[PDB]
Design a binder for this molecule. Sequence first.
Ligand SMILES: [Ca+2]
Length: 105
Amino acid sequence: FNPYTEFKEFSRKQIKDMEKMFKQYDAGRDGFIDLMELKLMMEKLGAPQTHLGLKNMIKEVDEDFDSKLSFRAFLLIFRKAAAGELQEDSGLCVLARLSEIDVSS
Ligand SMILES: [Ca+2]
């Protein structure tokens, strides 16, 4: 898929930064962040989430029904963040905040 045409609100630098973080936490190297990998990510960032909380984070952006996060789903988190669509202090809000990738340009 082409992230550059699908997510025109982000510069190529920003998309590559997001790719850097995505790859860092896809420990399995399969191109997805699954529930267990996302559990570890939230722990490492210092904001651990419950079983079902993590499932709901994935559900919110998993528009392709992978039951895990593709890179498209990951970018969608930042799109929702940048557009004010995430619930205040929700798991996805916290992920985007603690990622250190600034989308509040
Ligand atoms: Ca993976």
